[PDB]
Curated annotation (Swiss-Prot):
Primary role: Scaffold subunit of various histone acetyltransferase (HAT) complexes, such as the MOZ/MORF and HBO1 complexes, that acts as a regulator of hematopoiesis. Plays a key role in HBO1 complex by directing KAT7/HBO1 specificity towards histone H3 'Lys-14' acetylation (H3K14ac), thereby promoting erythroid differentiation.
Disulfide bonds: none
Organism: Homo sapiens
Subcellular location: Nucleus; Chromosome
Quaternary structure, from the entry: Component of some HBO1 complex composed of KAT7/HBO1, MEAF6, ING4 and BRD1/BRPF2. Component of the MOZ/MORF complex composed at least of ING5, KAT6A, KAT6B, MEAF6 and one of BRPF1, BRD1/BRPF2 and BRPF3. Interacts (via PHD-type zinc finger domain) with unmodified histone H3. Interacts (via PWWP domain) with dimethylated and trimethylated 'Lys-79' on histone H3.
Organism phylogeny: Eukaryota, Metazoa, Chordata, Craniata, Vertebrata
Entry comment describing in which tissues the protein is expressed: Highly expressed in testis.
Top-rank taxon, per record: Eukaryota
Cross-link position per record: Glycyl lysine isopeptide (Lys-Gly) (interchain with G-Cter in SUMO2): 41
Record-given protein name: Bromodomain-containing protein 1
Domain Bromo: from-to ranges: 9-113
Amino acid sequence: SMEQVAMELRLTELTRLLRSVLDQLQDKDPARIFAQPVSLKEVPDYLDHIKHPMDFATMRKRLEAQGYKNLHEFEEDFDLIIDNCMKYNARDTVFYRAAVRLRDQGGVVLRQARREVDSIG
């Protein structure tokens, strides 16, 4: 139908906007602490601690499958990255501190993405 096409075009354009959001958020992680999943070879007990692991590569796979239907879902995944890190790692660690900086700096990028998603519909 023409409606299904039009909806597909909306999802395509959301995917384009989220792709730019993801690139901007990941630049706020220059040390690449959140680039890939925590390794279960190197942290074999991770899943006893963290029930819903997340990282930027895993978000990128979901994005390119047009697997985010709205910005809320995308933000949920970003928030997991930060919140998982801040639980698993102690306050006095480079990991925790990197998460706090990512959260603070990403907030700005997400504040405007929310306006761009509401605005462009």
